[PDB]
Design a protein around this ligand. Sequence first.
Ligand SMILES: O=C(O)C[C@H](NC(=O)OCc1ccccc1)C(=O)O
Ligand SMILES: [Ca+2]
Ligand SMILES: [Ca+2]
Ligand SMILES: [Ca+2]
Ligand SMILES: [Ca+2]
Ligand SMILES: [Zn+2]
Length: 316
Amino acid sequence: ITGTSTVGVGRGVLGDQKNINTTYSTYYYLQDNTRGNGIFTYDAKYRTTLPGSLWADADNQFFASYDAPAVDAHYYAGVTYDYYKNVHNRLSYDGNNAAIRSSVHYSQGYNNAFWNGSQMVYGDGDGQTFIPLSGGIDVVAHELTHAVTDYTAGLIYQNESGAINEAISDIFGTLVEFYANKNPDWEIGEDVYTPGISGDSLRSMSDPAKYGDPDHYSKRYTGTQDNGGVHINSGIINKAAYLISQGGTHYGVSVVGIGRDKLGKIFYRALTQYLTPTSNFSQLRAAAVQSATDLYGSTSQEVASVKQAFDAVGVK
Ligand SMILES: O=C(O)C[C@H](NC(=O)OCc1ccccc1)C(=O)O
Ligand SMILES: [Ca+2]
Ligand SMILES: [Ca+2]
Ligand SMILES: [Ca+2]
Ligand SMILES: [Ca+2]
Ligand SMILES: [Zn+2]
């Protein structure tokens, strides 16, 4: 809608207070005009029809518990936009400042979030497995990164290309979490997963096997569930990314870490320059080596570390 840009205040899913960019025109709308062509947050009203209605609020204060998932979806989309712009010189997910849209309160007891090809969508969770999924910045950034992947490499959501697609979302999900400095870690979904149980998460990048995912190519899933294991075999790539950044010794192979910033640079380049819709793990290795070579030279420590990490997880 057309109106006056302003700033409102609200409380997120975890009870934290934050300022959000809104737009005033009779009502205050969750429409952020300060970033690209805008960030728009919608109320799906417990239904499955999308996007629902542009979130309207009478007083520019968002402290109702019904408001919380909208606050976080709106706010964390903004942070994710800032990350891609400031760190990678990318304007929104298409590189041309496309409007970013999210719907919250999708369906009832819905334990999931997704990019549907056009927008992000967040369930409220069932209150047991999940609380509202937009409450996690690594969740929001994971989703938005699916959009980035779709407009760049276009990795098919199936088998090894799908696992790479998933890992890219987990990796940048995590990098965005570190960027915002919000209790950052190498775990996925910890803020919104199992509110009854402390210290756990949905997946782990530092140790994927902790939650049943492979941390070595020899342990990959070869069946047909989960589109050929796209949320399972991603563990292999996630572990490699963890090693490149943090370093460590894994199945007897030692890796010197080069840190988060370079990890991000190398994988962003691979994603945008070298990966294709049907890239497999071995092609990912080649893309990452080539990207590090482009950026730091073929005899750099960076190239060496990328090679050791993929050796460590058994990807040749
Ligand atoms: O597979 C899909 O299309 C949707 C799937 N969604 C999903 O797993 O929702 C929960 C969640 C997402 C990110 C981080 C932690 C938890 C995905 O985006 O991979
Ligand atoms: Ca209000
Ligand atoms: Ca965290
Ligand atoms: Ca996390
Ligand atoms: Ca938990
Ligand atoms: Zn995903």
